[PDB]
Symmetry: C2
Subunit: 409 residues, 2 copies
């Protein structure tokens, strides 16, 4: 517990950019795109106001548009007098992917028409399309093969406080070891994480901070309308914060909270507000109505585990169950606890052989061990119960491909 | 119940089946079988023939059947086993786990075939486990997969009975003959003997 992420003070003008969303849509062969930027303002609404959105590739300005406020009519009462949508055409855009993280810079200027900049906001933009078609998850029209890992935010001396050095150290090692994707198990990450994945190039599953694993049954709260408000905020606020990062390719509704009607309501909310990314969620059997991707945890390659209600079928068998057509990407597989990873090659042979098996996220990146000091003051790696904590789950916190100090296992 | 149409020896295999001038001749082989056998309850699926590639005539006859007799699915393996002329993926000799990616008409592992993008049909092999001589090795692998995958609904082994013919030696004693034993040439030698049983019905 604690104030474990940054604290900052931000000055905004009274008339200000209160939100902005960037979208990139393409023609059939990705040789042409339209960047659309919806900008909202708060404060003093007057006809002299304008928004200019400009797009840059390095020091070159590739496109630019300026418009006054006032969006299209949307209903019988008119439109949003406090919003404007700019549409910029971009020819032959450089596309973003984890393989080549090409980025542009969009600068959003709020200004008077006669030239006074009130304030400017901005973001890195990655031109890419994410869509599931005919049972395949495609990025820029090609089927991805997810070489992923789940990564908690953990430092053996600082706990849950993340620092830039550590995050960079982690991304370098991930890429050096042929990973191309990371799942934010199980909550939104420190904001710099997304910037780093956008820039170095990693596909990201951004996940709402909702996990109620200890309830019995697991959906007791998620199926209860009284908890819809608290859950809604964890999903909606994450989307509002991270929707313009190109690294985020899939939204997740949280983890191990069964399948409740509140997940269905929230799945639909995100599909309405952000049609650019698929939404996934493993709870309730990994292939419920609240997921666009079959995303089991620890389903085996050939072996079925037919538990009642929530069986974990062989992944090859799961894809062809009667009526199923979605792609399957394990949200967790190959639990790397201790001397583990036995059978890892079996998963990769399957992924390469079956088109709709598009990979998965290993559990997990780094052991959650903490540093303790002995009588002589020498450091040593501690696990559950080592701090007097009880009940505890002992070494179950160490499931990493790397030790807490980032030395590889 | 399968129409008497097989043009395996043409090059390419659908040379006649894609030619409209052969539509009439083919149509009769399909329509007159349906007219004759459509009241038999044992017939559960109609087949458009065998190893004749995939031609427009097949599509035409597939729809004829579906229109006159909706009570039975229609299958046909030619042209890759999953064409528009078949309601069942019905490959011949596709293996359980191993793909055989031949050009144009690949034979995918049956487990993978079910799940190719967009595919939803059931899979029943029209022929599998070629029982020629000392054979049937790996037969259990097919059955373990059929029981594990709902959409893998079985198959028809190739085949029941060896096509050997009896000949008699100098002393008048009978012996089992195969291709070339009658002076026939060219011939395909023992490839006519692929059965689970000998010609006289003694089992292999
Ligand atoms: Mg305990
Ligand atoms: Mg010969
Ligand atoms: Na694949
Ligand atoms: Na754990
Ligand atoms: Na089956
Ligand atoms: Na034969």
């Amino acid at each position: 517990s604690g104030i474990f992420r940054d604290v900052s003070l931000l000055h905004k003008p009274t008339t200000q950019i209160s939100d902005f969303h960037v979208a990139t849509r393409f023609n059939d062969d990705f040789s042409r795109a339209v960047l659309e930027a919806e900008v909202q303002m708060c404060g003093e609404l007057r006809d002299y106001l304008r928004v200019t959105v400009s797009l840059w590739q390095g020091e070159t300005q590739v496109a630019s548009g300026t418009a006054p406020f006032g969006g299209e009519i949307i209903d019988e009462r008119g439109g949003y007098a406090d919003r404007v949508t700019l549409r910029l055409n971009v020819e032959n855009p450089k596309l973003w992917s984890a393989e080549i993280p090409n980025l542009y810079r969009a600068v959003v200027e709020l200004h008077t028409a006669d030239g006074t900049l009130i304030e400017a906001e901005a973001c890195d933009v990655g031109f890419r399309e994410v869509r599931i078609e005919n049972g395949l998850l495609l990025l820029n029209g090609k089927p991805l093969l997810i070489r992923g890992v789940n990564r908690h935010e953990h430092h053996p001396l600082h706990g849950q406080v993340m620092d830039e050095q550590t995050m960079v150290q982690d991304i370098l090692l991930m890429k050096q070891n042929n990973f191309n994707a990371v799942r934010c198990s199980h909550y939104p990450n420190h904001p710099l994480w997304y910037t780093l994945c956008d820039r170095y190039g990693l596909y990201v599953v951004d996940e709402a901070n909702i996990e109620t694993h200890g309830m019995v049954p697991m959906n007791r709260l998620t199926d209860d309308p009284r908890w819809l408000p608290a859950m809604s905020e964890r999903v909606t606020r994450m989307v509002q914060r991270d929707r313009n990062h190109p690294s985020v390719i899939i939204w997740s509704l949280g983890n191990e909270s069964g399948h409740g009607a509140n997940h269905d309501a929230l799945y639909r909310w995100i599909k309405s507000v952000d049609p650019s990314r698929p939404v996934q969620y493993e709870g309730g059997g990994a292939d419920t109505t609240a997921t666009d991707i079959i995303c089991p945890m620890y389903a085996r390659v050939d072996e079925d585990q037919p538990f009642p209600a929530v069986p974990k079928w062989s992944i090859k068998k799961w894809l062809s169950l009667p009526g199923e057509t979605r792609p399957l990407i394990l949200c967790e597989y190959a639990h790397a606890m201790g001397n583990s990873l036995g059978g890892f090659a079996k998963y990769w042979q399957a992924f390469r052989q079956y088109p709709r098996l598009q990979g998965g996220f290993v559990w997990d990146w780094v052991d959650q061990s903490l540093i303790k000091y002995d009588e002589n003051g020498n450091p040593w790696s501690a696990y559950g119960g080592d701090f007097g904590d009880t009940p505890n789950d002992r070494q179950f916190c160490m499931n990493g491909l790397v030790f807490a100090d980032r030395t590889p296992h």
